[PDB]
Design a protein around this ligand. Structure first.
Ligand SMILES: [Zn+2]
Ligand SMILES: [Zn+2]
Lengths: 207, 207
């Protein structure tokens, strides 16, 4: 379970620019790619969001852990995640795609949920077509509730990706996710990020 | 006389990512460098704050004009500027320094104002030591109005820099401030940003 019940409690106790930073680029009316668990909290979300944003021109938001270790204490689950700038950003966008990391060093997989079923299905379908393991979330991580930060975009229907630790390790050269090496990404990384852009494209193409 | 009375009015008329964007990086609990008039509104404030932020580790906020032409319509005067993320940012930083541009194509000068009299005086001194024209504003740009966005930091005391067009042109090679050229900066540019870091550094050494 979390250390902080929400982000106020977190902010009250932690020092900004030492344990955590926040990054925002609002540059799109329609779509925002973001993570509440970026930097060291869930490793690889920052870099994947950067690439997806660089590919799409989507807006960006990242609440980032900066500690060399033990960023898990900076984890506030998405249903409780209330950083005010995040909430302001979400409300200013029709759509939202969130990026998460879950522990499974033994299987490469992505579990996609959220209330935006159409974009949810599309991302699933693009990842697969790049040979990247992906399925609709079921026991866990389904995110069909109205609290999950991702469904608090304007449409009230977001898409959550929960990416296994094995998979995120395979984004980086040498399967090594050390900070020093997070600039060195693999072909799978690139394909993953392109899959997201394609799915966003068709979505806005169907609509 | 501003096209819009406040940021809500602008936002209800403009498209983000076409007319305007907002960039935020919260990474210091004491100091934020920012501009309500960045990108093409007051040209050169974006580039200066990038450099000052890189030198200092201070937090960043930019409200950027993006249009090729007529960025003037996106200028919302400091005392009216209430973009809520900027308002949020300022509230959580002890101190703040804002970068503005004013039109004077023939003189290099910076007019320094704000309720933070100590940091203001340091900035003028450090600017002057680099052979850069700067003085305490007295007849305009005094920035003592508690409504001016820069004074809405948690101390309620900010520092404002009003920098002449001639000065900002001089930040760029061939004195050319056309957007294509804005990554090509001068030595005077480097000096100017270096002065601000020395001011800040000298400042906190007090407390
Ligand atoms: Zn997460
Ligand atoms: Zn201005």
């Amino acid at each position: 379970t979390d250390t902080y019940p929400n982000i106020e409690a977190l902010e009250n106790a932690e020092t900004v620019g030492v344990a955590y930073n926040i990054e925002v680029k609002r540059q799109n009316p329609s779509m925002i790619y973001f993570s509440p668990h970026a930097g060291g909290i869930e490793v690889g979300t920052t870099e994947l969001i950067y690439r997806v944003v660089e590919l799409t021109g989507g807006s960006l938001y990242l609440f980032q852990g900066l500690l060399p270790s033990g960023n898990s204490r900076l984890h506030v689950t998405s249903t409780h995640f209330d950083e005010p700038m995040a909430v302001c950003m979400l409300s200013k966008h029709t759509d939202a795609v969130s990026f998460h990391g879950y522990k499974d060093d033994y299987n490469k997989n992505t579990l996609v949920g959220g209330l935006n079923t159409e974009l949810r299905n599309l991302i699933v379908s693009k990842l697969n077509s790049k040979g990247i393991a992906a399925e609709v979330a079921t026991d866990r991580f389904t995110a069909t509730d109205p609290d999950n930060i991702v469904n608090r975009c304007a449409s009230g229907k977001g898409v959550q990706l929960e990416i296994s630790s094995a998979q995120r390790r395979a984004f980086f050269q040498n399967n090594d996710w050390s900070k020093a090496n997070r600039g060195n990404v693999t072909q799978e990384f690139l394909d993953y990020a392109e899959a997201i852009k394609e799915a966003e494209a068709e979505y806005y193409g169907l609509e």
